[PDB]
Design a protein around this ligand. Structure first.
Ligand SMILES: Nc1nc(=O)c2nc(CNc3ccc(C(=O)N[C@@H](CCC(=O)O)C(=O)O)cc3)cnc2[nH]1
Ligand SMILES: Nc1nc(=O)c2nc(CNc3ccc(C(=O)N[C@@H](CCC(=O)O)C(=O)O)cc3)cnc2[nH]1
Ligand SMILES: [Ca+2]
Ligand SMILES: [Cl-]
Ligand SMILES: [Cl-]
Lengths: 159, 159
């Protein structure tokens, strides 16, 4: 099955190119715990934000352009990307925006981090109609010495 | 000599009730490059925020309270903190606010990172007179894929 994981600010704004104005190590640990040992599919901007292959995961880059690197798999289409993953229980789609747009319709699960931050932004996580999704897990956390803002982890299941 | 190093948001804000709302790996790399192989003096709250000893530097904690950790050196006064540095050419003071206020009078150099971020702070860098310091290095950078805000590196020397 296919899953989407993302960090959303107020109004569902997500990053486009520059790094988001927040510092949430708790959220990065959550991203890690949930994607480890799984293939991850991402767009070119996400690849640049990351800066190197995510370890312990199969890195698949979906893009209309040229693979600048031999350590990851570069695909030009969604079907190629899915194929690249092979036969696994869960495929993780890590963004950015267009990439989430493309896999949404095929997704069965969503791992979202809702962050209490108002950021001005162009892109938004695709519109998802909850009556179509079941919220099965939600856990809020306050900001602290290590996390710049309040955040709530949430898992949703496609009904 | 004694130097102070700090990251300042607009209005000299240096800390908030929670972690600062930004993600600036390049600033962190500049901090490391400038403190590596040097003794570092910090207050207890800064220490708590860090979590561990900074590798490759001698860590000195200035605080009225007793120890807590055996991997660093705990001191009770500024004189004590200085003496514990020994014979080194430059001592780095890394905050917070109170520590910076107390050591400014003896400092000859400032390594500052001005970050374009408007936040409500809790603590601020002490007020310094621009006429008393000479900027001998400055370098501006916009936010990018990995850094959330624009920032400018600056080194000032006491006139
Ligand atoms: N929840 C969630 N949070 C995010 O921050 C997020 N980021 C992306 C894309 N951006 C990034 C940027 C960096 C790393 C990263 O360095 N992760 C390391 C963890 C290292 C660490 O814990 O510092 C990884 O190993 O997963 C991951 C995704 C996608 N989905 C997200 N989803
Ligand atoms: N330029 C500057 N930027 C800062 O963030 C800053 N931070 C402190 C206090 N806090 C911190 C928090 C983390 C690390 C840290 O993990 N540094 C790593 C970089 C990787 C180190 O190895 O120095 C350092 C100082 C003091 N002066 C500063 N000075
Ligand atoms: Ca100058
Ligand atoms: Cl992308
Ligand atoms: Cl402190």
């Amino acid at each position: 099955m296919i899953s989407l994981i993302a960090a959303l600010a107020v109004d569902r704004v997500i990053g486009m190119e520059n790094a988001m104005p927040w510092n949430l190590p708790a959220d990065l640990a959550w991203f890690k715990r949930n994607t480890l040992d799984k293939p991850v599919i991402m767009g070119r901007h996400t690849w640049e934000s990351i800066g190197r292959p995510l370890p312990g995961r199969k890195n698949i880059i979906l893009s209309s352009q040229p693979g600048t690197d031999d350590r990851v798999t570069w695909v030009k289409s969604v079907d190629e990307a899915i194929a690249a993953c092979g036969d696994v229980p869960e495929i993780m789609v890590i963004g950015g925006g267009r990439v989430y747009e493309q896999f949404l319709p095929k997704a069965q699960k969503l791992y979202l981090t809702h962050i209490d931050a108002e950021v001005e932004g162009d892109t938004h996580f695709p519109d998802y109609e909850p009556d179509d999704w079941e919220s099965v897990f939600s856990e809020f956390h306050d900001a602290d010495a290590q996390n710049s803002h309040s955040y709530c982890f949430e898992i949703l299941e496609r009904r």
